[PDB]
Amino acid sequence: AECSVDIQGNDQMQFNTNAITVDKSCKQFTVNLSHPGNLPKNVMGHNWVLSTAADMQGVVTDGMASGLDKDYLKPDDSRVIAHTKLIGSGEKDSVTFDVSKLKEGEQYMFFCTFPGHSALMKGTLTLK
Amino acid sequence: AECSVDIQGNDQMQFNTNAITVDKSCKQFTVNLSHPGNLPKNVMGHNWVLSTAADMQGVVTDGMASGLDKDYLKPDDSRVIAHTKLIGSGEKDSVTFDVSKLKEGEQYMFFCTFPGHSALMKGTLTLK
Amino acid sequence: AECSVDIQGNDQMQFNTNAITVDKSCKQFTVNLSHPGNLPKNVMGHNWVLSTAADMQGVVTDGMASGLDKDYLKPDDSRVIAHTKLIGSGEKDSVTFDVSKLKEGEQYMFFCTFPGHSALMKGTLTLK
Amino acid sequence: AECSVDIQGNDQMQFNTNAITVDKSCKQFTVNLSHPGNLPKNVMGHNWVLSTAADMQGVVTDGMASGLDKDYLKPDDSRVIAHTKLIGSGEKDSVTFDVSKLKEGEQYMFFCTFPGHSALMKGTLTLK
Ligand SMILES: [Co+2]
Ligand SMILES: [Co+2]
Ligand SMILES: [Co+2]
Ligand SMILES: [Co+2]
Numbered sequence: 316a317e318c319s320v321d322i323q324g325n326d327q328m329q330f331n332t333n334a335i336t337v338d339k340s341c342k343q344f345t346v347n348l349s350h351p352g353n354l355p356k357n358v359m360g361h362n363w364v365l366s367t368a369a370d371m372q373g374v375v376t377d378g379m380a381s382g383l384d385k386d387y388l389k390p391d392d393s394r395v396i397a398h399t400k401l402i403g404s405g406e407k408d409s410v411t412f413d414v415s416k417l418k419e420g421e422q423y424m425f426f427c428t429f430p431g432h433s434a435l436m437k438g439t440l441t442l443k
Numbered sequence: 444a445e446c447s448v449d450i451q452g453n454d455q456m457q458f459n460t461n462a463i464t465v466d467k468s469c470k471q472f473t474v475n476l477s478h479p480g481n482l483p484k485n486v487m488g489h490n491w492v493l494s495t496a497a498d499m500q501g502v503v504t505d506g507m508a509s510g511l512d513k514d515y516l517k518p519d520d521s522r523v524i525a526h527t528k529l530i531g532s533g534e535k536d537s538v539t540f541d542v543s544k545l546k547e548g549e550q551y552m553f554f555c556t557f558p559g560h561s562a563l564m565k566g567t568l569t570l571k
Numbered sequence: 572a573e574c575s576v577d578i579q580g581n582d583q584m585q586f587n588t589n590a591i592t593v594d595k596s597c598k599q600f601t602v603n604l605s606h607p608g609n610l611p612k613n614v615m616g617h618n619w620v621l622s623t624a625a626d627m628q629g630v631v632t633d634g635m636a637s638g639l640d641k642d643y644l645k646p647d648d649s650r651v652i653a654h655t656k657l658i659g660s661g662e663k664d665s666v667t668f669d670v671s672k673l674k675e676g677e678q679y680m681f682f683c684t685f686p687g688h689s690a691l692m693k694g695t696l697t698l699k
Numbered sequence: 700a701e702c703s704v705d706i707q708g709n710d711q712m713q714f715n716t717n718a719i720t721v722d723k724s725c726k727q728f729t730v731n732l733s734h735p736g737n738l739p740k741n742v743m744g745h746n747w748v749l750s751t752a753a754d755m756q757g758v759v760t761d762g763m764a765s766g767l768d769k770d771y772l773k774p775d776d777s778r779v780i781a782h783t784k785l786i787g788s789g790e791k792d793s794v795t796f797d798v799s800k801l802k803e804g805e806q807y808m809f810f811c812t813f814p815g816h817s818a819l820m821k822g823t824l825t826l827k
Pocket of ligand 3: 580616617618684685688
């Protein structure tokens with residue numbers, strides 16, 4: 316899939332991938348998140364969030380503080396480049412962002428903000 | 444001390460310890476479980492369940508299947524030596540079991556049956 | 572691949588894949604393991620081990636007790652269906668086994684036995 | 700007590716707590732770290748490093764490059780507020796620091812820099 320990627324977050328709190336690459340030719344980029352499995356969103360919610368590796372911790376810590384009702388993300392969080400909604404099993408969501416929001420020579424991370432999940436669910440995103 | 448132990452499961456899906464030792468001089472052993480944090484039982488519940496290491500996976504799988512209504516535990520599971528109720532933040536439980544139900548030379552595990560949790564929340568229990 | 576799979580273990584304690592499907596038509600099945608990255612064996616050691624889901628905890632526990640010189644695997648562990656050596660970055664290893672060693676209706680896990688890596692490095696393997 | 704906290708980092712790559720709150724009335728604050736278990740420092744070393752959340756990634760990445768020889772921390776790292784030595788099992792270390800190096804409103808994290816360990820061995824520290 317050019318300028319896009321499909322990623323799954325399953326019931327074992329695992330994303331199917333740990334590395335995403337964005338082609339510099341891509342003007343925009345889409346990340347499609349699906350959740351195979353059977354567990355509902357309150358027990359095994361998955362969202363997908365992108366930020367520099369530097370801000371990942373603060374976004375997680377603040378996302379937790381915001382709670383369920385907030386999809387565990389601090390609203391208008393200026394550190395978040397892009398993020399999907401928190402989904403439960405069987406659901407799907409995509410988020411498209413401008414590639415110009417990313418510098419070559421900077422480390423980014425994608426990760427889930429549901430409490431405790433980032434330990435397991437995280438990977439790197441890099442321009443190419 | 445000695446014949447009882449205070450355990451906490453937090454909002455970051457972790458127990459405060461991963462090892463417990465039962466002195467053979469105890470007739471009974473009491474485990475007190477509290478849930479520091481702010482998240483609800485339906486989102487981040489914790490119980491504390493004891494079984495041989497060999498039966499743990501069955502207990503976790505059959506528990507998952509049982510749903511929130513059953514405290515993520517299969518009714519009358521004979522594999523479970525003991526267990527607390529499933530608790531939410533700001534809640535607590537206690538459970539006592541006769542030390543005679545344990546044998547020296549057998550590998551025992553304590554853990555949480557709330558979906559996905561045992562991956563991180565578990566520990567060893569030994570008769571020493 | 573055909574009756575085989577290539578899997579990598581990295582410096583971020585992650586396997587590139589978390590679900591392995593073995594086809595019944597396969598007489599044998601090959602698992603190729605590589606460790607991209609730059610960290611050595613005593614620090615970011617990776618082996619790939621296969622056992623029923625029920626046997627995983629005992630294998631990991633006895634494995635931690637075998638020591639580094641034993642690749643953190645108890646020699647002659649009857650629960651281990653197949654395994655690799657413990658490798659560091661830049662190294663590679665593979666193991667092939669008979670598909671008749673697996674049965675329909677049983678749950679299998681693949682995992683790393685290096686101290687503290689199995690909570691993050693594990694996946695399922697199923698005979699289809 | 701009051702201006703001190705006991706932290707244990709075990710053989711399962713975890714800390715006993717994930718949140719430290721330092722009371723403003725403290726002039727100095729102590730972190731006593733111990734290491735229950737039996738694994739050695741070259742395989743399951745733990746330290747206790749403090750810095751702002753925004754800085755954690757850098758301290759971890761740079762520390763990971765410094766090596767065992769440097770206790771997995773960059774010498775004279777200007778982002779490190781306080782830190783312990785890297786310890787193996789049965790060892791203990793303590794670090795006391797001036798509370799005026801912390802400011803209200805700023806998010807601090809404590810973590811272990813041995814490669815890979817920060818996935819699970821981290822927590823927050825707040826001046827309250
Ligand atoms: Co999630
Ligand atoms: Co739990
Ligand atoms: Co490993
Ligand atoms: Co450590």
